[PDB]
Amino acid sequence: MKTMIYPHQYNYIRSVILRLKNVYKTVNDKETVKVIQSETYNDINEIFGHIDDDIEESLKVLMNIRLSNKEIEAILNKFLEYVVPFELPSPQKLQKVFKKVKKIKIPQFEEYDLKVSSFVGWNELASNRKYIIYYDEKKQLKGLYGEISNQVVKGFCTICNKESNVSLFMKKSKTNSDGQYVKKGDYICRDSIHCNKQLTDINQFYNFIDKLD
Amino acid sequence: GMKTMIYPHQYNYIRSVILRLKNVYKTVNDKETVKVIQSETYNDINEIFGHIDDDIEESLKVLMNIRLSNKEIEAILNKFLEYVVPFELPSPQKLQKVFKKVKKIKIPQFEEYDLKVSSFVGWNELASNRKYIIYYDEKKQLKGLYGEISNQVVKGFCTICNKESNVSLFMKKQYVKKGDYICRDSIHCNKQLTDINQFYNFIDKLD
Ligand SMILES: [Cl-]
Ligand code: NA
Ligand code: NA
Ligand code: NA
Ligand code: NA
Ligand code: NA
Ligand code: NA
Ligand code: NA
Ligand code: NA
Ligand SMILES: [Zn+2]
Ligand SMILES: [Zn+2]
């Protein structure tokens, strides 16, 4: 049985593999290549409690300076087999998370996209909203929405930490007994699917959520 | 103070090496490796400009500090963007000439930023399973082609930008055509394109 890994761990493995390939291609310093080779081997190896023969072979191929694009493709495809994809909730569970939102519905998602997703986010332009759903560390379905500005700028996304097309996302806290609430937020990728593909550390996502208060 | 003119792919390359350096600062804990990457990055950027100025000098100084921040990076990218000569969209009359056989042809609307990062312009017409591509050759002449783009999407390295992407088989428009896999989304393709020679080689290997 293949070890199960999370989508963000797959994204991380892909990231370090591509970083290594770029070092092979463009960095002429022998000792630097060795340092990055070792770092990459460790970065990938540490994800698994347990590496099997296929991963051992992939690592061997990765550690060769003649690593090719075709070889990378094959290795990425192999690593994808280990991923447990994001599980879209049933309509009844989704509605329980957004009890005050009538008629709510999550757009269809391609299977690869669920394999790289730590959360699912979609925009409803009519209401200028982004909806976000995810599971917490206890595997409970959670959801929120906020206003997403129409203005898009270049900046680093607060969730994935990559330089991207971002918009200001503002969430209202639950309204207290006196009708008062806090409204906080920050810039995040307008396109949450691309955001998820860029997300290699899920703690960044959870930190974003917590910062909304 | 006139700004040295650079090409969109050169800006993309500069952005690429800056992000690479930041990731080394953040994740690679080896003093000598950091210094090597710092020096390479400095050289990569300096060599693109040749003629620099006080703004570039200041940007390089900030980049060379291991405390480089995201906010500083965004500021530097915005400054460097000011040096780029964007892709020039052709007038409709000129576009017509390039595609004489195609009627009612019209380029989509493109954002200003997207033109600053574009070495070519590509768009899809799903009704005909077609991708159109326009570009300027090395003699600055406007050129265009189109072909069938498969509806099948796979993960793989793009023949144009050389990055791992969502690619589809493109066949330039009986006979056998093997095709080449390229990004379905040409705007994203362009953003990933840091070496113009890869694009030209792709063109050459069609025609
Ligand atoms: Cl290769
Ligand atoms: Na990394
Ligand atoms: Na790479
Ligand atoms: Na890299
Ligand atoms: Na790269
Ligand atoms: Na590079
Ligand atoms: Na990175
Ligand atoms: Na790391
Ligand atoms: Na080039
Ligand atoms: Zn993001
Ligand atoms: Zn491409």
Author numbering:
A (entry chain A): 10 to 222
B (entry chain B): 9 to 181, 189 to 222
Paper text:
FA blocks bacterial protein synthesis by locking elongation factor G (EF-G) to the ribosome. FusB is a 25 kD protein that can provide low-level FA resistance in S. aureus. The N-terminal domain is an elongated up–down four-helix bundle, while the C-terminal domain is a more spherical alpha/beta domain stabilized by a zinc ion. We conclude that FusB provides FA resistance by preventing formation or facilitating dissociation of the FA-locked EF-G–ribosome complex in both of these steps.
After optimization, crystals in space group P21212 diffracting to 1.6 Å resolution grew in polyethylene glycol at pH 5.5, and crystals in space group P1 diffracting to 2.3 Å resolution grew in polyethylene glycol at pH 8.1. The structure was solved using single-wavelength anomalous dispersion with P21212 crystals soaked in sodium iodide and refined against the native data. FusB crystallized as a dimer in the asymmetric unit of both crystal forms. The A molecule of the P21212 structure was fully ordered apart from the His-tag, whereas the other molecules displayed disorder in one or several loop regions. In the P21212 structure, we observed a continuous density across the domain interface between residues Ser15, Lys162 and Thr200 that we failed to interpret. Attempts to identify any bound ligand by mass spectrometry failed. Below, unless stated otherwise, the higher-resolution P21212 structure will be described. The two molecules in the P21212 crystal form superpose with a root-mean-square deviation (RMSD) of 0.41 Å for 200 CA atoms while the two molecules in the P1 crystal form superpose with an RMSD of 0.49 for 197 CA atoms. Beta strands S3–S5 form a non-canonical treble-clef zinc finger motif, where, in this case, a zinc ion is coordinated by four strictly conserved cysteine residues in a CXXC-X23-CX5C motif. The zinc site forms a small and rigid core that stabilizes the overall structure of the C-terminal domain and the interface to the N-terminal domain.
